[PDB]
Amino acid sequence: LFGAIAGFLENGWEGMVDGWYGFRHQNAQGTGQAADYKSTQAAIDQITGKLNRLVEKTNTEFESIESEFSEIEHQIGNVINWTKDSITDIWTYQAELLVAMENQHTIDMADSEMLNLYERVRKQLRQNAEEDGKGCFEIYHACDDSCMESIRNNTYDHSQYREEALLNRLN
Amino acid sequence: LFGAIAGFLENGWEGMVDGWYGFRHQNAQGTGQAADYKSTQAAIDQITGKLNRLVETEFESIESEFSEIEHQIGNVINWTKDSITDIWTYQAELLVAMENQHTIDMADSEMLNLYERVRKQLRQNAEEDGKGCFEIYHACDDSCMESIRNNTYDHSQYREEALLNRLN
Amino acid sequence: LFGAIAGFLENGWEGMVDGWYGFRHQNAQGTGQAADYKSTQAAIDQITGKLNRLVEKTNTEFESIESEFSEIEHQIGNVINWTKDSITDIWTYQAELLVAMENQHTIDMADSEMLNLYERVRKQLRQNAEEDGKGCFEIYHACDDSCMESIRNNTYDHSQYREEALLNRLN
Amino acid sequence: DKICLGHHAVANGTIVKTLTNEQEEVTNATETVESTGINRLCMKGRKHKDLGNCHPIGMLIGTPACDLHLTGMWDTLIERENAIAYCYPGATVNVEALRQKIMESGGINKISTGFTYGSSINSAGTTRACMRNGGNSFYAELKWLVSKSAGQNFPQTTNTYRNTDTAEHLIMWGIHHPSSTQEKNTLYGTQSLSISVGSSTYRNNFVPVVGARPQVNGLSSRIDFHWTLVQPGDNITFSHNGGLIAPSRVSKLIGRGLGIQSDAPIDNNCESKCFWRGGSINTRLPFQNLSPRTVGQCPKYVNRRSLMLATGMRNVPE
Amino acid sequence: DKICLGHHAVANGTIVKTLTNEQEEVTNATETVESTGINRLCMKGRKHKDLGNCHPIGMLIGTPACDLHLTGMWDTLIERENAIAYCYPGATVNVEALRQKIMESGGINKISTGFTYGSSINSAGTTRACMRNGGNSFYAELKWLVSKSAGQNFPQTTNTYRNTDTAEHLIMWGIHHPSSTQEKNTLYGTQSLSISVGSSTYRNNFVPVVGARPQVNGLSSRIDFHWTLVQPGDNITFSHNGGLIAPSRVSKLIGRGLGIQSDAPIDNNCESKCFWRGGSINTRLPFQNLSPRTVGQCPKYVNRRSLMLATGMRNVPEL
Amino acid sequence: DKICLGHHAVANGTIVKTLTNEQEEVTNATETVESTGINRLCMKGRKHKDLGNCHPIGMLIGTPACDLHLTGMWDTLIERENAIAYCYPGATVNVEALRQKIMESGGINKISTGFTYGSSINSAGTTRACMRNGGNSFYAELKWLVSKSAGQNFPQTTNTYRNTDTAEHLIMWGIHHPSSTQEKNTLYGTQSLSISVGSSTYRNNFVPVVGARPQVNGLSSRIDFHWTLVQPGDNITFSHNGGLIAPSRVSKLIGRGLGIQSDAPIDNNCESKCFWRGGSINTRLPFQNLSPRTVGQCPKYVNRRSLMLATGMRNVPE
Numbered sequence A, C: 001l002f003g004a005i006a007g008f009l010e011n012g013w014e015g016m017v018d019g020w021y022g023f024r025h026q027n028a029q030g031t032g033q034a035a036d037y038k039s040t041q042a043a044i045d046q047i048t049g050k051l052n053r054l055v056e057k058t059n060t061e062f063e064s065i066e067s068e069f070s071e072i073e074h075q076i077g078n079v080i081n082w083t084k085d086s087i088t089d090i091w092t093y094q095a096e097l098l099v100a101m102e103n104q105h106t107i108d109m110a111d112s113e114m115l116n117l118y119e120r121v122r123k124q125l126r127q128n129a130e131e132d133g134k135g136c137f138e139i140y141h142a143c144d145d146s147c148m149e150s151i152r153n154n155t156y157d158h159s160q161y162r163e164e165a166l167l168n169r170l171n
Numbered sequence B: 001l002f003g004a005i006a007g008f009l010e011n012g013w014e015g016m017v018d019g020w021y022g023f024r025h026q027n028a029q030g031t032g033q034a035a036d037y038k039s040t041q042a043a044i045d046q047i048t049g050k051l052n053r054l055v056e057t058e059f060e061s062i063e064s065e066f067s068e069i070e071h072q073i074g075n076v077i078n079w080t081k082d083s084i085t086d087i088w089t090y091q092a093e094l095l096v097a098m099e100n101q102h103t104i105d106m107a108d109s110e111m112l113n114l115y116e117r118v119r120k121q122l123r124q125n126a127e128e129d130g131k132g133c134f135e136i137y138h139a140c141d142d143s144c145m146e147s148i149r150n151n152t153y154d155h156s157q158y159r160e161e162a163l164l165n166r167l168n
Numbered sequence D, F: 001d002k003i004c005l006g007h008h009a010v011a012n013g014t015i016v017k018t019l020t021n022e023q024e025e026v027t028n029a030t031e032t033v034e035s036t037g038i039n040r041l042c043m044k045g046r047k048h049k050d051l052g053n054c055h056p057i058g059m060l061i062g063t064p065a066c067d068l069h070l071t072g073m074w075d076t077l078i079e080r081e082n083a084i085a086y087c088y089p090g091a092t093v094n095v096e097a098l099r100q101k102i103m104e105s106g107g108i109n110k111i112s113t114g115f116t117y118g119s120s121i122n123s124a125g126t127t128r129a130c131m132r133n134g135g136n137s138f139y140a141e142l143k144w145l146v147s148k149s150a151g152q153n154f155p156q157t158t159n160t161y162r163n164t165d166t167a168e169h170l171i172m173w174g175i176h177h178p179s180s181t182q183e184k185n186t187l188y189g190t191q192s193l194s195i196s197v198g199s200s201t202y203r204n205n206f207v208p209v210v211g212a213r214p215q216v217n218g219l220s221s222r223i224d225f226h227w228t229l230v231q232p233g234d235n236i237t238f239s240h241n242g243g244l245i246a247p248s249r250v251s252k253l254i255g256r257g258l259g260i261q262s263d264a265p266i267d268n269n270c271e272s273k274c275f276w277r278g279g280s281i282n283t284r285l286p287f288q289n290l291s292p293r294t295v296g297q298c299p300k301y302v303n304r305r306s307l308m309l310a311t312g313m314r315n316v317p318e
Numbered sequence E: 001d002k003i004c005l006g007h008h009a010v011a012n013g014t015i016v017k018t019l020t021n022e023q024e025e026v027t028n029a030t031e032t033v034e035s036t037g038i039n040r041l042c043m044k045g046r047k048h049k050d051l052g053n054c055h056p057i058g059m060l061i062g063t064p065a066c067d068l069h070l071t072g073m074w075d076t077l078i079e080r081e082n083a084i085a086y087c088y089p090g091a092t093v094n095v096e097a098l099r100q101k102i103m104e105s106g107g108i109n110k111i112s113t114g115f116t117y118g119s120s121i122n123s124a125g126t127t128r129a130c131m132r133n134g135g136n137s138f139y140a141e142l143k144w145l146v147s148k149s150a151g152q153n154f155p156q157t158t159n160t161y162r163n164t165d166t167a168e169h170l171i172m173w174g175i176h177h178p179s180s181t182q183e184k185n186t187l188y189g190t191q192s193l194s195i196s197v198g199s200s201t202y203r204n205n206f207v208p209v210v211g212a213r214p215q216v217n218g219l220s221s222r223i224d225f226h227w228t229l230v231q232p233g234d235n236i237t238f239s240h241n242g243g244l245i246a247p248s249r250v251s252k253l254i255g256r257g258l259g260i261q262s263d264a265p266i267d268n269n270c271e272s273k274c275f276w277r278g279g280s281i282n283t284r285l286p287f288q289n290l291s292p293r294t295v296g297q298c299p300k301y302v303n304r305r306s307l308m309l310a311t312g313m314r315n316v317p318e319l
């Protein structure tokens, strides 16, 4: 479990059908919402991988050992009932585990991609911002809508606004 | 593996018994050791969930326990049962190992989660010593301590006083 | 997945063979490179316990149930062929799941060991350094080689440089 | 000023099972256990035989139901429930071993045995039990040998069949068991009946048994059927006093095919690689709940109504 | 002043296996293999019949061992190690299939055949090998037909049993193989013996095989048994003239039940859904190492004394 | 002024499979499925018997090819492709169950049966079809009994083998099926032939099935074999009219060992626990893809050419 999705973020946003992970900013120029293409697609490309893996099951040709329209001798019949059933039991255990285990990875995978986006912005914001407990960054220099485009863009040059922010954090 | 247990925490506390995770503090009024409930239920519940899975077909007889059975069929019965047992044993071992792997590493997880909720909480009035402690840069009493364990602590109340300490 | 490998670290260093994880440094004396013992050993240890299991030898003895050279009774040999293929389908599934699952875990554990060193170095340096988001630390005092070694040997004392570093972050 | 990171959620989500939580709610999910199948035998791509009311054993003896299916090729042979094999009452020895051999083949060829009998023998016996065109008849590959002259001892006769082919031939004969001594006498005589069959890989003797049994199809006499594979270059022979229902043809099971036993109709335009008695199974999922007994490349049967695989993150609504 | 974080630990840890570590200390752990089970059969909740020294075959032909098991209803039938099936030296064709049909059943009705024989025949034959009240008897469900008039050709007889029921019916019969020619001549006459049996679904004839010389050697008297299923509405006829051990009753197997082969003693205060030679198995736990060969709703047998499931975090105690 | 962290990479990494991804590159991997085996049988630490042109059935009846194999002791028993069980036409009834009792065994003893025959009998019958060391011969462990005076009826004989050992003893016998009715009469007489055989735990009657007309035809002189175990303390008796190929010895299978059917040559230098048709398998690995038919302590066959297991991290080059 990574810290984020059932964690320090309160809840998901239903209002975001745009993609799986997204930004919401509140500056002087109103508020906006946009979804990060990079991070959802990391997750989506992994979920679709697990789907390819499950359906890639080339198999053996199996022939009939149980007569559907006639009896077979009791002794062999009971061996065939015992084996067939014992394979099903193995194969039912194998499925029930495949899924539990593929699901635990799937939530936790998606949970990580969130934190990776969180860290990705945190590190990029450098000294110009701080984190509250929820998934927010209080940005301590005045933010243009263009600069916000720039934080998602991964192009935000922290050193530009560094002195402005660094003062506001202190005064 | 998350950094916490067997990681940057040099050891566990045999003393803490009200929880699996918890805080020790140091101040004027002395020291003390509270367990964290929220983070201790988070783990105990995920553990009792792997167990509910654990406890969750009617089979007749094919081998005759007290009389001879025809040889050719008898040697097919032994092969299948030996084969099947190989499967159930290999399966049993993977499950146990995969489960213990996840368990230990999920615990590690619930610890780093605690640590990280506390760090974002003490926004700038402390910093990490790297062995699991925060050094709080202001005056902090027993009311301020539960304040940190309740997750009720307001940092801006102390921010001005704490920053002046981190700088002089 | 943890943030590091094939993440904010753009790439591996084909140059480093000293160990699996390492340090590169730049300072007035020039560029150096060393590799971390503790954390490459952690990772190679966790690989051996895997390979150590993989070769678990405990095996039941199996006798022939089909005759390679002679004909076998036609119904029982169909119950055999059906049984043998079933068991194989099972093992083939298990095998692939094993290496698929085990491969996952390994890549991820490797990521873990790198990140942990990062967040280990991150903590020593305390207020003396800031993160560049690409896996380097920018250090806010001068650091000769016996000081670089100091960080790798994990003996770096931060308050030693803190004043200098505190007012170079600000100035 | 402020910037925030979030994940999406949906109003009404899905539930899946995980390692630690039976009841864990994700946003999206697909099935891994296929629940619906097709009620058709999807045979596009297959050279197949729908046997109808023919039972594969019929093909070898040429019962009247089976006349359209005496020879041919397939890569898939479909046997049906109302299947007729015998039209005169009787049984076959190792009938399931035998049956399965045919159901695994890619076809049959018929080969004349060329057996010829004396003047003392009428090889043309027929019965009200086997009808072709409102008229008494008999199995197409056997010939009921009885005395041409009633009551006379069926002559001691010796027939030999040589397999000069390159593969193994399946050959069948019947041993007749009269319903009474009035009867056993009229066809074969008062003489002791004996039927020795010989190959390199088979030797056995049969003796017609007289006894009253229930009447079936009207009759109290039976026909027991027998078979063995005749190796290439191998000869097989019959010594018979009377009572042998000899073969006029022998079978050669060619190639390899795929025996489907099923109740569902045929679709020569739908394409499939997995069959059950209900029809076919065209799915990509690894598992299915439809039937424990399946034939061909099939997803493995599991005992669960449903299994759901998360395909989205944990769902936390507002 | 500071604030610190930390996890609990213990002194006496327990060690489990993981993907990377075959020796990993942990705070708490639980067994996943039930190793103990219960060396008594636990037949609470079950209408069970214990066969004691009676073997399930003998219920069908009525050996003195099984005189209290010729009928019944049960959901768990129990069979003990050296159960008697035959008193008169012999064997049963396909006995392994017939044993299992009984052991699967939930009970037996017996229905008479109402076979009768003419005056020239004695149907009350007995023998020293099958004893009731410690004197000469025979199978309760079979009759030994011999020439009343010793020496005399056993008359060509014929006997039909009609299944006027709705379920199918199990019919057993016996063929007698005399110890010597001398003897066969007495019991059935000098004529050639022949027994034909026919239903609408079954045909067969049997010839008694006379053995020779002293009683001591293998070729001495025997009674091989044979059995078919008679379909509902189906008749079945015996055409014979000596050698036949004719049935005087047939069986009907009722319903379905669980068959157990154990020598464990019955315990009626505990219930259980799993069994082996040793006794019952009762465990929440998914796997067991008691017996490879079990019956019922059982934990899967695995080749290990112990696999431990960590039910706690990694354990790092203070130095 | 700056300190960096990083990880190694390799010029060319190896592609392996993960849960979320095929083709995921890694710094190093290794194979988990064994694709190469030693092509010789490895018998170090094993006392083994390589039967050679002998076939296990021949061991019990002593065919000439099998002369040096009538007794033995072995951990292992190897059997080869074109192996010879009989020198005289005929088969063994129920022969596969028997081969396996011989292949599951750990050694063979021979015990004489002490069978003795009257004057009227030639018990020293031999045939050209069994050339031992250049001359007409017969099976070592059986005796082909015939009428000392040709044509005159074979006498009513009795023979009793008693097992007095504490282990079950496998006894075998032959029944001779004459070629022509003329012949049956020479060796045995015109009398009706009958062989009963009975222990406490067996009972049977065999009658020779006489052939007709040419030697070439399916029905000729053959000898078919039968068999039964005799339990400790138990007597077994024969009652023949002639037609009996009676045993002079019985067998006792001792201990338990591993039967291998292989075409591979024996290597005593090499050690191993797992074998197949074409050699051995000495591997660390848990899976093998050489063959689905193996015996011994074995890595499980899987239908995959290759399964690479990452031993290194992701390989990100520059």
Ligand SMILES: CC(=O)N[C@@H]1[C@@H](O)[C@H](O[C@@H]2O[C@H](CO)[C@H](O)[C@H](O[C@]3(C(=O)O)C[C@H](O)[C@@H](NC(C)=O)[C@H]([C@H](O)[C@H](O)CO)O3)[C@H]2O)[C@@H](CO)O[C@H]1O
Pocket: D124, D125, D126, D127, D128, D129, D136, D144, D146, D178, D179, D183, D187, D218, D219, D220, D221
């Ligand atoms: C209770 C009752 O009235 N019915 C039976 C009656 O069936 C049975 O007679 C037999 O009747 C059948 C059905 O009509 C045939 O007609 C029998 O003669 C035939 C036949 O058609 O099969 C004539 C045929 O040409 C014969 N074929 C040959 C080659 O033999 C066969 C053949 O004899 C018998 O099948 C072999 O036994 O029979 C006719 O005998 C009588 C006597 O069984 O009993 C009545 O009670």
Ligand SMILES: *[C@@H]1O[C@H](CO)[C@@H](O[C@@H]2O[C@H](CO)[C@@H](O)[C@H](O)[C@H]2NC(C)=O)[C@H](O)[C@H]1NC(C)=O
Pocket: D162, D200, D233, D234, D235, F216, F217, F218
């Ligand atoms: C089957 O019969 C044929 C002949 O009918 C046998 O083959 C013959 O071999 C003999 C001697 O080698 C020759 O005289 C014949 O001319 C051959 N026949 C032909 C037509 O080539 C053959 O050996 C018999 N096969 C058996 C009984 O196994």
Ligand SMILES: CC(=O)N[C@H]1[C@H]([C@H](O)[C@H](O)CO)O[C@@](O)(C(=O)O)C[C@@H]1O
Pocket: E124, E125, E126, E127, E128, E129, E144, E146, E178, E179, E180, E183, E187, E221
């Ligand atoms: C019904 C019948 O005939 N039974 C007689 C049997 C048979 O003669 C032989 O057992 C078979 O060969 O022998 C007895 O000595 C016996 O067994 O007590 C006397 C008995 O009355």
Ligand SMILES: CC(=O)N[C@H]1[C@H]([C@H](O)[C@H](O)CO)O[C@@](O)(C(=O)O)C[C@@H]1O
Pocket: F125, F126, F127, F128, F129, F144, F146, F178, F179, F183, F187, F221
């Ligand atoms: C014991 C005996 O009689 N063997 C004789 C046999 C058999 O009679 C026939 O093989 C069976 O009919 O025939 C021979 O030609 C032979 O095989 O060499 C001569 C031989 O002495």
Ligand SMILES: *[C@@H]1O[C@H](CO)[C@@H](O)[C@H](O)[C@H]1NC(C)=O
Pocket: D027, D028, D029, D030, D311, D312
């Ligand atoms: C839900 O799954 C379907 C099919 O896998 C897909 O089309 C859809 O995009 C998924 N919904 C989301 C947005 O996760």
Ligand SMILES: *[C@@H]1O[C@H](CO)[C@@H](O)[C@H](O)[C@H]1NC(C)=O
Pocket: D214, D215, D216, E162, E200, E233, E234, E235
């Ligand atoms: C069964 O017996 C009854 C009584 O004779 C008779 O009516 C009926 O025809 C018989 N059934 C068969 C199948 O012959």
Ligand SMILES: *[C@@H]1O[C@H](CO)[C@@H](O)[C@H](O)[C@H]1NC(C)=O
Pocket: E027, E028, E029, E030, E311
């Ligand atoms: C650990 O678990 C076991 C079984 O779950 C239990 O008996 C024991 O009381 C628990 N002990 C602890 C908490 O160490």
Ligand SMILES: *[C@@H]1O[C@H](CO)[C@@H](O)[C@H](O)[C@H]1NC(C)=O
Pocket: E216, E217, E218, F162, F200, F233, F234, F235
């Ligand atoms: C074998 O015969 C001896 C004497 O002939 C006798 O002691 C023994 O009981 C016999 N064994 C059997 C099983 O009849």
